[PDB]
């Protein structure tokens, strides 16, 4: 593809190979995929979160099959938050990063709050149908967006 | 007469019409 491996690039590659073999009985987007990309930077304090970059047909491939896959990869891989993201190289690309980063939920709104001075902030508010399994991951979504892009956006469910 | 209206032209709602002669009349007063 485009890289020479790293210590956890080989780890995530051998992970998806031991998802090739000795498991399910579910096999859709795993075999036509090779090493694509992976990245690891601190989130919060004391905790980490892995992100894995994937090509654009494999995006909707993983959108067909991503339920319980992130779950098992989180459980047997380092007990940490797994995020799946495209590899790209401006604002439409940033909205693409947003809607790729939030996989089970469709966002509802982007909210640009100006203040009493020229300071501004963004708030993206998500769907109401799924709330329970995200609030422990919302901060991780926010910090990985802040590290990959650099813009300060906060993620919330409206009330 | 309302005191808030400027006198350079006429106002419809939030729209101020200024004819070319009035802006040229300002172009006379600046010189």
């Amino acid at each position: 593809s485009r890289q020479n491996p790293s210590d956890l690039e080989r780890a995530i590659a051998g992970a998806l190979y031991d998802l090739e073999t000795n498991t399910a009985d579910l096999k859709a987007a795993l075999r036509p995929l090779q090493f694509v990309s992976a990245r690891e930077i601190e989130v919060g304090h004391g905790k980490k979160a892995i992100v894995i970059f994937v090509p654009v047909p494999a995006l909707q491939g993983f959108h067909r099959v991503q339920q319980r896959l992130t779950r098992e990869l989180e459980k047997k891989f380092s007990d940490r938050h797994v995020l799946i993201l495209a590899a790209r190289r401006l604002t439409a690309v940033h909205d693409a990063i947003l809607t790729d980063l939030v996989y089970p939920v469709e966002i509802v709104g982007k909210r640009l709050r100006t203040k009493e001075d020229g300071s501004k902030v963004l708030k993206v508010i998500l769907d109401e149908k799924e709330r329970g399994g995200v609030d422990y991951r919302l901060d991780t979504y926010s910090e990985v967006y802040r590290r990959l892009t650099g813009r300060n956006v906060t993620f919330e469910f409206p009330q | 007469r309302p005191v808030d209206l400027p006198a350079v032209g006429r106002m419809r709602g939030a729209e101020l019409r200024i004819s070319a002669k009035e802006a040229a009349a300002i172009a006379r007063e600046v010189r």
């Binding site: 009493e116 | 005191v3 808030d4 709602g13 939030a14 300002i26 172009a27």
Partner: protein, 126 residues
Amino acid sequence: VRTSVLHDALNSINNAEKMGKRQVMIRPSSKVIVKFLQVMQRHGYIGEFEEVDNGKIVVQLNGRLNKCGVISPRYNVRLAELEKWVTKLLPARQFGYVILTTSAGIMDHEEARRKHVAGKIIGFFY
């Protein structure tokens, strides 16, 4: 149909400043309206506003502004012309502001004096 969406927004703010509301829902949005609002918030004549999307803007207004207006012919102006234009457009030189699209962006007449940039009068408020 009025193609000046910023004029429709200024009319909305004028009617809300007359009837005394505390917010509005300006349905068609534009970046120039955003910039006018930022100058408005610099001079504190509006409380706080948020751009929301389908978009529109919620504009919480305090009740300090009196009247909004747009110069439709979008008139080009130089420095001495800026001073004389602002003295014939606002009721007092120590009240209200006019808006310019200069080469340095969109700002009021005091900022255009600080940068010494001339430009094009578009709108005003008090």
